[PDB]
């Protein structure tokens, strides 16, 4: 009936401080996609399980350090609505596993093709009330990814 | 006050979807403020060469892999106005550029002032909006979008 997609919000506690003063709370990964839009890592499933496809896609897009974990059904968060069903997952990593994913991503299959690069989501809001999170949210996103990010940030009290 | 930034680029024979030629890998950064921009930053009076200062900040922002090249006066391209943003474009090999991408993840600024690097998609998808025209509707810092555009016309794209 539908064409199934799976995306994953990968995040890690980050005790780091911007400019020595501003607290990042989490490292949260999103990808700049080949179409110029921010989105979550993942894609379409085809693949013995929905978690199989998602993890395969994560490997193709993030590289082999994505085999150091495995997004399982336990990690499964939401399903949003062409005839595409968007299955949203969230996976808590150590900042270690996440840094390693940032390094390995510059040499995944999709580097420079489908994936134009990774970014962290600024959770802070800067001085003038625009810089940081609010400005970040005014870029362009693939369908729902802004809503899945907002949905997920409040599932963490943020 | 003066700032220096650098468009670093290299030929990629990659064919997106097997059909769309990526012509050049062109490197921009997502800054801590949620805006796209070019590697670089403010130049000082302990740098007494605009070029010395720019290379220093690409060491800070991209890591030691940026030591495999130097951006020079001969690469200068524009200035815009108080701060004065000086802009340079530097041709690298893909392997050099690639080294900078994998270096950037271990640079000082990674995870703080630099949220991550992104390439510029130089193509337009068939719908006529995906790719370069949508990328250009993202938020940019300072003169960075016009510097991106001048650089793309002066390279004939
Ligand atoms: Mn100009």
Author numbering:
A (entry chain B): 18 to 63, 66 to 100, 104 to 180
B (entry chain A): 20 to 100, 105 to 180
What wording appears in the published article?
The overall structure of Nudt16 is similar to those reported earlier, with rms distances of approximately 0.6 Å for the dimer. The loop containing residues 101–106, located near the ribose of FAD in the complex, shows substantial variations among the structures and has weak electron density in the free Nudt16 structure.
The Nucleoside diphosphate linked to another moiety, X (Nudix) superfamily of proteins constitute pyrophosphohydrolases of substrates that include (d)NTPs, nucleotide sugars, capped (m7Gppp and Gppp) RNAs and dinucleotide coenzymes including NAD, FAD, dephosphoCoA (dpCoA) and their derivatives. Among the Nudix proteins, Nudt16 is the most promiscuous. Similar to DXO, it can hydrolyze RNAs harboring an m7G cap, unmethylated cap, NAD cap, dpCoA cap and FAD cap on the 5′end. To understand the molecular mechanism for the recognition of FAD-capped RNA by Nudt16, we determined the crystal structure of human Nudt16 in complex with FAD at 2.7 Å resolution and the structure of free human Nudt16 at 2.3 Å resolution.
